[PDB]
Amino acid sequence: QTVTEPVGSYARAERPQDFEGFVWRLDNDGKEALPRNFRTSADALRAPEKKFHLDAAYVPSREGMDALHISGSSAFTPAQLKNVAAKLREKTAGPIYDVDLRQESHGYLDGIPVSWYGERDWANLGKSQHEALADERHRLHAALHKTVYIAPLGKHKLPEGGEVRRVQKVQTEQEVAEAAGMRYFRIAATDHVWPTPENIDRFLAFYRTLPQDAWLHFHSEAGVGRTTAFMVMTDMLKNPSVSLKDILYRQHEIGGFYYGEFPIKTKDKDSWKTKYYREKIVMIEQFYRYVQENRADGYQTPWSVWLKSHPAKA
């Protein structure tokens, strides 16, 4: 019997036309030297956050963490990114990658990091990566020499204050990454939800081509959901002997999200998120299974293919 949307693909049921972009959102006010939630795999573990009801006494294995060479953060200003790159260059002599996980169209107007925000940050929901990047390219270019309104989100994810300017310079994140001495790689993943099979296939192929000394700096809007997902996936790929529990604990304890089971709770206005949290918990487990069952033969079978013959259970 037909299943319309399998586990891992719940977001496909949502209607993109209901979340179209309406404002240039300020992604970072540029006040700090670094982006928020900045963390590397070299960092010491800290106490787990109370909301996840984890075992504070637990001491996760650090097997492979010194060699892992990844980091994560929120969005950043160009200056903040140069600070990130200088900081990482101290840890490695390999190429440093800015891995941009944002599906939403974003860039820099007069050096100000902005994104084209629709409700739930789903302005590019349902678009292929090709379409998402075309929207981004067109929108950014159309802003040049035009008057724009750039605002942070306040009460209820609506604009609050902000500023108005006639734009004199437009840049993509790629341009800003390269100016900072980083290589650039884009995975257009949708905010709030599990990355698509497409997203993950693209990441995996990318991962297989990296030189051994590559450092991956993942980032999304806040450096939480999407950033932690790919940091976790990378940790599993590179350190397949480490237990799922150790992976989840250690990626949370250096400053990420915890992607295991926990007592979920939402303000009723945030109750749409609940099923996306469960979905992510299940898919993390399914990806761990993929890594275990496909690493012997060197990942001959792509995630998307394997997932269709080995579907996840709600």
For ligand 4IP, the binding residues (CB under 6 A) are: 121, 191-192, 220-227, 273
Phi, psi of 206 (to 5 degrees): -55, -45
Contacts (CB under 5 A) with Cl ion, residues 126-155? 128-129
Q: Is residue 222 annotated as involved in ligand binding?
A: yes
Q: Is residue 169 annotated as involved in ligand binding?
A: no
Q: Is residue 72 annotated as involved in ligand binding?
A: no
Least distance between a copy of itself and beta carbon 90 (Å) = 41
Partner that binds at residue 198, options a copy of itself, ligand 4IP, Cl ion, none, CB closer than 5 to 8 Å by kind:
Cl ion
Report which of 195, 229, 220, 170 is spatially closest to residue 304, judged by C-alpha positions.
195
Which residue's CB is nearer to ligand 4IP, number 49 or number 63?
Answer: 49
Residue 149's DSSP bridge partners are 164
Q: Which two tokens stand for residue 220?
A: 């999304």
Which residue's CB is nearer to ligand 4IP, number 120 or number 238?
Answer: 120
Which residue's CB is nearer to a copy of itself, number 56 or number 164?
Answer: 164
H/E element, 74 = none
Partner that binds at residue 129, options ligand 4IP, Cl ion, a copy of itself, none, CB closer than 5 to 8 Å by kind:
Cl ion
- The set of residues, in sequence order, having a beta carbon less than 8 Å from that of 309 and lying 6+ positions away, is none
Q: Which residues bind a copy of itself (CB under 8 A)?
A: 17-18, 20-23, 118-119, 146-149, 151, 154-156, 158-164, 166
Q: Which two tokens stand for residue 207?
A: 């991962």
Q: Which two tokens stand for residue 224?
A: 């939480």
CB neighbour class for 107 (10 Å; exposed up to 12, middle 13-18, buried from 19): buried
- The set of residues, in sequence order, having a beta carbon less than 8 Å from that of 77 and lying 6+ positions away, is 28, 30, 111, 112, 113
- Binding region: 25, 157, 192, 221-226, 273, 277, 280
Q: Indicate the annotated binding residues for 1D-myo-inositol hexakisphosphate.
A: 25, 157, 192, 221-226, 273, 277, 280
